[PDB]
């Protein structure tokens, strides 16, 4: 991503044509190509991928392949209006419940932005499938109204008995809960950890770890206490909890998740990353594959930053207010500090090049 | 929109067939009742709300692990068997409760109480947002505060304001009103207060005016009444049973502390003693400043002029002054309120309140 090229696509493309997953492997290649060619214009991929699906090449009768070709098209062509119609025919061609959810998402991506009632409404009727609950997250950032409801709304869904609803909501939470505490879900999860089965315990603790990522001490506490209270009592338990402690403290505990930023703009990349890890990361859950896929979760993960710079605009001493610990030198961890000082261009959050008034002219 | 209807109608239909099949097995009509106790031999003794008790068998919709004592339940009529579970939100569980989930009142709306504002903030708001300062040092937090003064102006305002800031359920119970005249029923009523709290946290528990059930006497013979003391003790034992870092902060109202037990203070719980005073010049300036925003008025009126003739009054007097003043302006048929109007109004309420007098200059 950011250095996309046709040459690898040409080499990879007929091997994708060979298609069975345990051998030539390139059925999954589709995920990788999609994420590379995110958010831009490139008809070659769209067409090649589109024919191969519609034709029903090689060993096309595997479910995983129908999934890969559907998703690949949608992921790559984000924000391409009319062009997008081609993709809509393939995805539409094999109906699913994932697909009724995805009609609104492709429309968001293509027509540019979100802000209308319809798209929240159309999902809301299905909710009250995995992809559908995931989808409120992606939609709500443009909805002025939408964000406050999201946190209550998926809180309810976790508790729902049925096993599928139980796997899918924790991943969504693992992203969410590093900036949005919700009491209800964390308190529930403790009982569900010993509910009736080994697999549910695997997922629970792993889930607590995602949610804990980059966030430590304070308001987290009710979730934090549950994690400490497990370490081992079995060899399966030892293994899972240890993996949880790395997640909990990923990037030395001071990393964050944002799917929207303070510089008023969204990221296409970040929607695609989450989408692609969802197809993967299933090793200790339903939809089993292999362990390596965990790592795709990384692309989403951001260091926290407010970066002051003085009048040089490149690293130079400059001070802005205290953290939790003192007033800061440049590049020194902390986030969201507004200041007195006047920018060159626009006082807001983010990397800022700053200038100080001549009445107390300073490097600060 | 169009998309929902196409899907909705075939989707609705399968559900209804299943739903009909469910409905037939479980029956109707039913009495609602309350579980007396839950028994693990798959039985239940239940309290029927018509009165009598029946030792009944559960009909499987839920287990006895998906049931709790005092849950509301659907009862048949066979012997009153448990058909299904029902929520307790609707069916009574209250003493005297005003529930105001996130109240209208806020610090901004009651002017400058700023010094009082600061105390209540470090005790009640700060743990809920930040367990972390208490945790790091390793000290317990105040989980109670006491508000002293008169309500509507001191005790009531600060407590409404803070709840709105923390986005917690404000529960006002009137202490005296429980002061029921029959032996034994205060203690039930205290139980229901604590029961609701633990179910429905975060919450601010406001107990108004505990000085009728708050008594603790020296006797129970010779005009001594035994209920009053019992109720005071049940209240105390639950309070000391509950401890939190940010699930419950308790606000009390009362104007005597030597009618209360030293274990209802419980030193190491109630650290904070917040009391109303009459405000400073600066804070008075702020109370005036907000209230005149809302007026249309002359420009001969100043905040400064109004301050100097004030001797330190409550914020309530300042509010009262504004309503009285506008009424002389509306009587003169006009919407301009002079410096003279607010001055006539202030003098008049001050005069009605200060019924006792004492020469202090000598």
């Amino acid at each position: 991503a950011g250095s996309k090229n046709d040459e690898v696509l040409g080499l990879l493309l007929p091997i994708a044509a060979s298609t069975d997953l345990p051998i030539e492997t390139a059925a999954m290649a589709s995920l990788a190509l999609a994420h590379v060619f995110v958010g831009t214009c490139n008809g070659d991929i769209t067409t090649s991928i589109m024919d191969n699906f519609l034709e029903r090449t090689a060993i096309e009768l595997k479910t995983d392949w129908v999934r890969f070709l559907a998703l690949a098209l949608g992921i790559l062509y984000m924000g391409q209006g009319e062009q997008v119609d081609d993709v809509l025919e393939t995805i539409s061609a094999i109906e699913h419940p994932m697909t009724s959810a995805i009609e609104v998402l492709v429309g968001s991506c293509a027509y540019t932005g979100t802000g209308d009632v319809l798209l929240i409404q159309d999902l809301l009727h299905r909710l009250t499938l995995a992809y559908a609950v995931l989808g409120i997250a992606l939609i709500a950032l443009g909805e002025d109204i939408g964000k406050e409801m999201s946190l209550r709304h998926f809180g309810h869904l976790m508790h729902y008995g049925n096993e599928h609803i139980r796997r899918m909501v924790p991943l969504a939470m693992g992203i969410v809960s590093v900036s949005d505490p919700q009491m209800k879900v964390f308190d529930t999860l403790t009982r569900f950890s010993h509910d009736a089965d080994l697999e549910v315990s695997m997922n629970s603790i792993f889930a607590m770890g995602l949610c804990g990522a980059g966030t430590n001490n304070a308001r987290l506490a009710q979730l934090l206490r549950q994690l400490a209270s497990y370490y081992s009592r079995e060899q399966d338990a030892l293994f899972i909890t240890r993996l949880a402690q790395g997640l909990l403290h990923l990037g030395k505990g001071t990393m964050t998740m944002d799917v929207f930023n303070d510089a008023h703009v969204l990221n296409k990349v970040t929607l695609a990353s989450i989408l692609t890890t969802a197809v993967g990361l299933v090793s200790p859950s339903f939809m089993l594959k292999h362990h390596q896929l965990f790592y795709m979760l990384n692309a989403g993960i951001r260091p926290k930053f407010i970066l002051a710079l003085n009048d040089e605009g490149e690293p130079i001493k400059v001070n802005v207010r205290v953290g939790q610990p003192v007033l800061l030198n440049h590049g020194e961890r902390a986030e969201l500090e507004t200041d007195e000082y006047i920018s060159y261009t626009s006082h807001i959050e983010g990397v800022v090049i700053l200038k100080k008034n001549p009445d107390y002219r300073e490097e600060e | 929109f169009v998309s929902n209807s196409e899907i909705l109608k075939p989707f609705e239909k399968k559900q209804e067939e299943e739903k009909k099949q469910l409905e037939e097995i479980r029956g109707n009509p039913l009495s609602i009742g309350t579980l007396e106790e839950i028994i693990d031999d798959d039985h239940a003794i239940v309290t029927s709300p018509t009165m009598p008790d029946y030792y009944v068998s559960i009909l499987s919709f839920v287990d006895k692990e998906l049931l709790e004592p005092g849950c509301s339940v659907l009862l048949h009529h066979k012997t009153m068997s448990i058909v299904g579970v029902l929520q307790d939100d609707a069916d009574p569980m209250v003493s005297v409760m005003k529930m105001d989930k996130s109240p209208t009142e806020s610090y901004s709306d009651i002017g400058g109480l700023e010094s009082q504002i600061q105390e209540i903030k470090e005790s009640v708001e700060l743990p809920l947002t930040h367990p972390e300062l208490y945790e790091e040092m390793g000290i317990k937090p105040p989980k109670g505060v006491i508000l002293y003064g008169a309500p509507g102006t001191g005790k009531t305002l600060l407590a409404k304001a803070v709840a709105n800031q923390t986005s917690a359920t404000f529960l006002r119970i009137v202490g005296s009103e429980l002061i029921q005249k029959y032996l034994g029923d205060g203690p039930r009523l205290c139980r229901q207060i604590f029961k609701v709290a633990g179910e429905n946290a975060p919450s601010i528990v406001f107990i108004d005016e505990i000085d009728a059930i708050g008594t603790k006497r020296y006797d129970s013979n010779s005009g001594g009444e035994r209920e009053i003391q019992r109720t005071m003790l049940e209240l105390l034992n639950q309070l000391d049973g509950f401890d939190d870092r940010g699930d419950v902060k308790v606000i009390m109202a009362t104007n005597k502390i030597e009618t209360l037990d030293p274990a209802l203070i419980r030193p190491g719980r109630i650290d904070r003693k917040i009391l109303f005073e009459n405000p400073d010049l600066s804070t008075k300036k702020k109370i005036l400043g907000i209230h005149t925003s809302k007026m249309n008025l002359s420009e001969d009126v100043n905040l400064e002029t109004l301050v100097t003739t004030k001797d330190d009054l409550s914020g309530a007097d300042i509010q009262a002054m504004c309503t009285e003043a506008g009424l002389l302006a509306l009587r003169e048929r006009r919407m301009q309120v002079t410096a003279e109007d607010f001055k006539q109004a202030k003098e008049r309420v001050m005069k009605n309140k200060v019924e006792e007098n004492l020469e202090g200059l000598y």
Binding site: G161, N162 | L59, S60, S81
Partner: peptide
């Protein structure tokens, strides 16, 4: 998986129990 398991259990048990209690209620309980 889980949702279907719970409901079947609850219908199955309930019909047997409903027959047994009614039998013990005969007499006038």
């Amino acid at each position: 998986l889980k949702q279907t398991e719970n409901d079947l259990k609850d219908i199955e048990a309930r019909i047997k129990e409903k027959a047994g209690v009614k039998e013990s209620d005969t007499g006038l309980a």
